[PDB]
Amino acid sequence: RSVARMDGDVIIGALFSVHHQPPAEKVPERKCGEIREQYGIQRVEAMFHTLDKINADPVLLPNITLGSEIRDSCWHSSVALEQSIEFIRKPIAGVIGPGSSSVAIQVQNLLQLFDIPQIAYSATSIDLSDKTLYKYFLRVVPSDTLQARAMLDIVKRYNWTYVSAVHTEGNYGESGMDAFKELAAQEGLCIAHSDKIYSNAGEKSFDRLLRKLRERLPKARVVVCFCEGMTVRGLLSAMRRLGVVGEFSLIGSDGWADRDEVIEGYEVEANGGITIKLQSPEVRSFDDYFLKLRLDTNTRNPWFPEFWQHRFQCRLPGHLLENPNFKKVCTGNESLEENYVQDSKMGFVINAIYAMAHGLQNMHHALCPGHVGLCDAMKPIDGRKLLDFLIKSSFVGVSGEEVWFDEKGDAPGRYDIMNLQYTEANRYDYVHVGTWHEGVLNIDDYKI
Amino acid sequence: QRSVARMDGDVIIGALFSVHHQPPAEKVPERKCGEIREQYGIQRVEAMFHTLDKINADPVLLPNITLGSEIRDSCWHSSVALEQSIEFIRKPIAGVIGPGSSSVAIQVQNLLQLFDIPQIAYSATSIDLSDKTLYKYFLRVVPSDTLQARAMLDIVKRYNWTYVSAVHTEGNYGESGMDAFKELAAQEGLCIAHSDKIYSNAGEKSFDRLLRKLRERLPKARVVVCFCEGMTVRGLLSAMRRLGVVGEFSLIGSDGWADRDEVIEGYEVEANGGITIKLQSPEVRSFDDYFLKLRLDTNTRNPWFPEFWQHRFQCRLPGHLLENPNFKKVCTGNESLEENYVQDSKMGFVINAIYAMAHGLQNMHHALCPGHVGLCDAMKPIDGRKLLDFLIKSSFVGVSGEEVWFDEKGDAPGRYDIMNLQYTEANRYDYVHVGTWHEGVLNIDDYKI
Numbered sequence: 001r002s003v004a005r006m007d008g009d010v011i012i013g014a015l016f017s018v019h020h021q022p023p024a025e026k027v028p029e030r031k032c033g034e035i036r037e038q039y040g041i042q043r044v045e046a047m048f049h050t051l052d053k054i055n056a057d058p059v060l061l062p063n064i065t066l067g068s069e070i071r072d073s074c075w076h077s078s079v080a081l082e083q084s085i086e087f088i089r090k091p092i093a094g095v096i097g098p099g100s101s102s103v104a105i106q107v108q109n110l111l112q113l114f115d116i117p118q119i120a121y122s123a124t125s126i127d128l129s130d131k132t133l134y135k136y137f138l139r140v141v142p143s144d145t146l147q148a149r150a151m152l153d154i155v156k157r158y159n160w161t162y163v164s165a166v167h168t169e170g171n172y173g174e175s176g177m178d179a180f181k182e183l184a185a186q187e188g189l190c191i192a193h194s195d196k197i198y199s200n201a202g203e204k205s206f207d208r209l210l211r212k213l214r215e216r217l218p219k220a221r222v223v224v225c226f227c228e229g230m231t232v233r234g235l236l237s238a239m240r241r242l243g244v245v246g247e248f249s250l251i252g253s254d255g256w257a258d259r260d261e262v263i264e265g266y267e268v269e270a271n272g273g274i275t276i277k278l279q280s281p282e283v284r285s286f287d288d289y290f291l292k293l294r295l296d297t298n299t300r301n302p303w304f305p306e307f308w309q310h311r312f313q314c315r316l317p318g319h320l321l322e323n324p325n326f327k328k329v330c331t332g333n334e335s336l337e338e339n340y341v342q343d344s345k346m347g348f349v350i351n352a353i354y355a356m357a358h359g360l361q362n363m364h365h366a367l368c369p370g371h372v373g374l375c376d377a378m379k380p381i382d383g384r385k386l387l388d389f390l391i392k393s394s395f396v397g398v399s400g401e402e403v404w405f406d407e408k409g410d411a412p413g414r415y416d417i418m419n420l421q422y423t424e425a426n427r428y429d430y431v432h433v434g435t436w437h438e439g440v441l442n443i444d445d446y447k448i
Numbered sequence: 449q450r451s452v453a454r455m456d457g458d459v460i461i462g463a464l465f466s467v468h469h470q471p472p473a474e475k476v477p478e479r480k481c482g483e484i485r486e487q488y489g490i491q492r493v494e495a496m497f498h499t500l501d502k503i504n505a506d507p508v509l510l511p512n513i514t515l516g517s518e519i520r521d522s523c524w525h526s527s528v529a530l531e532q533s534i535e536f537i538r539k540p541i542a543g544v545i546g547p548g549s550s551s552v553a554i555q556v557q558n559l560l561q562l563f564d565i566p567q568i569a570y571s572a573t574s575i576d577l578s579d580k581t582l583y584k585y586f587l588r589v590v591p592s593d594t595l596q597a598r599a600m601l602d603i604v605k606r607y608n609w610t611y612v613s614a615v616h617t618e619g620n621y622g623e624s625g626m627d628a629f630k631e632l633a634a635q636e637g638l639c640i641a642h643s644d645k646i647y648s649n650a651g652e653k654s655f656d657r658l659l660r661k662l663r664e665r666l667p668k669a670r671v672v673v674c675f676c677e678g679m680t681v682r683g684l685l686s687a688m689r690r691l692g693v694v695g696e697f698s699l700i701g702s703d704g705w706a707d708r709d710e711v712i713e714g715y716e717v718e719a720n721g722g723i724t725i726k727l728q729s730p731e732v733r734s735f736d737d738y739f740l741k742l743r744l745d746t747n748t749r750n751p752w753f754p755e756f757w758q759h760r761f762q763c764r765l766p767g768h769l770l771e772n773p774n775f776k777k778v779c780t781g782n783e784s785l786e787e788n789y790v791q792d793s794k795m796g797f798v799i800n801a802i803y804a805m806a807h808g809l810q811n812m813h814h815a816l817c818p819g820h821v822g823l824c825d826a827m828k829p830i831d832g833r834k835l836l837d838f839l840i841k842s843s844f845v846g847v848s849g850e851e852v853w854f855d856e857k858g859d860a861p862g863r864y865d866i867m868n869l870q871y872t873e874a875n876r877y878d879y880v881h882v883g884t885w886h887e888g889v890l891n892i893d894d895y896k897i
């Protein structure tokens with residue numbers, strides 16, 4: 001499997017969903033789906049970019065260059081584990097990712113055996129806060145103990161007393177929904193229908209899911225989905241097949257948030273949806289770098305050629321990765337600015353990388369006092385010690401966010417409440433209608 | 449540097465057994481295990497040694513090819529099991545026996561499958577493991593809980609009940625078991641009245657509500673199917689006592705209840721008449737003949753024996769690397785293993801899992817090395833992907849005379865005992881054996897119920 005590398009004194013591993021997960025039938029041979037931009041290429045480039053800057057920075061890690069070994073997780077436990085084995089087969093100092101809680105648990109179960117700290121940028125499961133089971137895990141995002149509370153507050157806000165519940169099979173949906181149901185039970189909120197499903201389940205399964213939900217109408221119109229985006233898309237698609245529109249009031253978790261790829265093509269069935277988004281400021285710095293990448297000068301990113309052809313539905317003559325679905329040759333001058341959309345969690349990806357650097361810096365200050373570069377004490381780097389320095393690190397993120405971790409490796413965070421609506425213009429957009437921070441729900445009622 | 453039980457041979461079979469209890473929660477990061485175990489540990493380690501000795505003396509099974517072993521401790525925990533599984537992939541292991549727990553077996557299989565190493569379980573019963581897209585290299589000689597659902601439904605249909613309530617304990621066991629029951633029930637025209645789930649540790653208030661919801665469906669739905677942990681049943685019995693009701697329902701429970709006294713202890717009156725399922729556990733006399741004769745000074749192939757002996761007979765071994773600090777008297781070495789002796793209830797499964805591995809290797813040899821006495825180039829090294837194909841199609845007669853074979857998903861047939869709680873001729877409540885579910889056929893003594 002391809003691997004994006006950058007040499008340096010200390011090597012940082014990373015796991016990103018460069019491709020979609022393998023089709024249910026291909027799982028055994030671990031053959032992945034199509035190339036991804038927001039969750040794949042953009043994150044791979046964000047790592048390269050962040051490391052470039054850090055290595056060009058005189059204050060952070062003065063004479064210590066950070067290298068990398070970026071691997072594809074295909075958002076799947078089996079591929080992620082396969083690739084994590086490669087990390088431990090210069091030794092990896094720490095790992096960034098993967099994005100899924102279930103997948104993250106699989107990776108952490110192996111990494112902890114070699115004392116390799118892991119920092120997530122999107123794994124929000126409450127379970128990962130258990131340090132007896134996940135000692136070497138930390139993250140720059142808040143656990144879903146909060147998101148579940150935010151979701152219940154929204155339901156309470158609009159006096160909904162009877163709701164249906166759906167979650168994506170796996171640790172993220174299961175842990176999040178269990179927390180929500182626990183809160184609901186305390187508050188006396190009734191759950192009409194409850195169901196679960198795998199994001200990659202067949203259409204017949206999503207058909208069944210939808211049918212079961214409709215049967216609980218019209219009393220159970222509100223549907224709480226602690227779901228991955230693809231699970232939500234699977235449901236919209238099922239609504240498309242049955243010819244139904246606007247029957248439910250969907251309230252989704254961060255797997256949906258304000259992601260365009262989730263509702264693309266199904267804006268009609270998705271319209272009116274209310275979602276939760278992890279607050280993360282747009283990273284302009286990244287756009288300036290990313291949009292200037294060219295298919296001829298970007299050689300450090302092994303997947304770029306595959307990406308370009310897919311991004312511009314064109315093919316590369318003679319290229320081994322020539323796409324057999326497009327005829328118009330790639331002019332190699334197409335603009336990455338067309339319909340461009342930055343990964344919604346870009347800030348977290350970047351700050352997770354910076355957290356790793358700050359951990360290494362803090363460790364160097366303590367173990368190699370007065371030394372210029374790495375000293376005997378950090379040759380090799382002791383993962384167990386690096387973990388403690390990471391947990392005790394605090395800094396200002398790429399966009400001003402205060403980043404630090406509590407004893408459980410959890411970071412502070414908050415959410416933006418989004419509402420999908422048909423704007424004045426002939427277009428559907430994610431309107432920012434509110435926020436949830438420290439138990440306080442603020443929603444602009446006139447905006448909804 | 450965790451100890452390993454070894455026996456060299458032409459082909460090495462790996463094994464993961466719970467030689468020790470899992471690490472206390474706070475000792476998990478350091479993977480420091482608990483107390484030594486006998487039935488789930490030492491007895492299984494010895495069962496493997498004994499079985500291999502027997503197979504190596506068997507003129508019909510692998511006549512001129514010896515089997516060896518690399519037995520590791522799983523401490524009934526995924527971190528230790530993974531730690532030890534890493535050691536297997538670090539002579540290469542042809543296959544792995546174990547581990548015992550489904551959640552732990554899943555973690556082990558996620559890794560083994562990456563190296564095409566077939567894994568055969570003797571006690572992991574999770575329905576999840578039947579998914580070959582996720583667990584291609586997993587097979588087992590113990591039935592999947594989906595067969596418990598089947599047996600329980602067969603019991604319900606036998607007495608022509610049309611409506612039943614359904615309760616299951618939260619978690620994989622309870623939820624998967626009940627989902628299986630419900631799928632079958634729907635397909636066969638059985639209606640579900642009240643349906644619920646609950647944690648065994650839920651409060652009395654929660655069990656009070658559960659009982660109220662069940663009673664609301666009376667008298668039409670007098671039968672309650674419980675795919676539950678024993679303590680969930682106990683919670684329900686406890687609620688019946690508080691409410692002051694008796695014999696209103698006919699409870700049918702999965703093996704979480706089985707024939708456990710701790711479940712009905714003090715609530716025999718409200719439990720009386722319940723029907724439960726239990727995995728059959730045929731005693732393997734030949735194992736006892738071997739195990740009961742083991743001695744401290746001569747058993748040097750089992751590295752955990754010294755520790756086991758000290759704990760088993762509450763004595764210490766002066767200056768031993770693992771000298772038990774809880775007892776002052778010294779072991780004589782002539783204590784008898786027969787005192788309070790109890791044979792691991794899964795012993796037959798453990799032995800048959802080992803025999804299944806041997807038969808898969810034998811079948812592979814016959815097909816890939818025809819005419820060769822020993823292993824030929826086609827089996828140097830053994831192609832795990834091929835061994836998996838041969839294992840799946842292997843069948844034989846087990847240690848207790850049962851027929852062992854696997855379906856396409858690597859699942860095994862199921863044989864359960866059917867119990868009925870009754871008040872015997874004496875002033876006592878006993879779990880009376882009233883039937884069996886023999887691989888699809890329900891045999892019940894209708895008069896005893």
Ligand SMILES: *[C@@H]1O[C@H](CO)[C@@H](O)[C@H](O)[C@H]1NC(C)=O
Binds near residue numbers: 062063372
């Ligand atoms: C440290 O790195 C800087 C790069 O800006 C270089 O100019 C300087 O000479 C280096 N110092 C040492 C002691 O290597």
Ligand SMILES: *[C@@H]1O[C@H](CO)[C@@H](O)[C@H](O)[C@H]1NC(C)=O
Binds near residue numbers: 157158159
């Ligand atoms: C919820 O119900 C209360 C009580 O009837 C009412 O005062 C409040 O305005 C309602 N809020 C919404 C959003 O409907």
Ligand SMILES: *[C@@H]1O[C@H](CO)[C@@H](O)[C@H](O)[C@H]1NC(C)=O
Binds near residue numbers: 511
């Ligand atoms: C194979 O094993 C049998 C059974 O003990 C033995 O009689 C025979 O001599 C062996 N063959 C060889 C070539 O060693």
Ligand SMILES: *[C@@H]1O[C@H](CO)[C@@H](O)[C@H](O)[C@H]1NC(C)=O
Binds near residue numbers: 606607608
């Ligand atoms: C179940 O119903 C069938 C059909 O009437 C009947 O033949 C059979 O005897 C019944 N069994 C019992 C145990 O009542």
Ligand SMILES: N[C@@H](CCC(=O)O)C(=O)O
Binds near residue numbers: 101124
């Ligand atoms: N927070 C989700 C991931 C959502 C997403 O990034 O799409 C998880 O922990 O799995």
Ligand SMILES: N[C@@H](CCC(=O)O)C(=O)O
Binds near residue numbers: 551571794
């Ligand atoms: N069947 C249980 C294990 C039972 C036992 O041996 O204690 C499981 O799948 O985890």
Ligand SMILES: [Mg+2]
Binds near residue numbers: 061063
């Ligand atoms: Mg620097």
Ligand SMILES: [Mg+2]
Binds near residue numbers: 506508510512
């Ligand atoms: Mg033999």
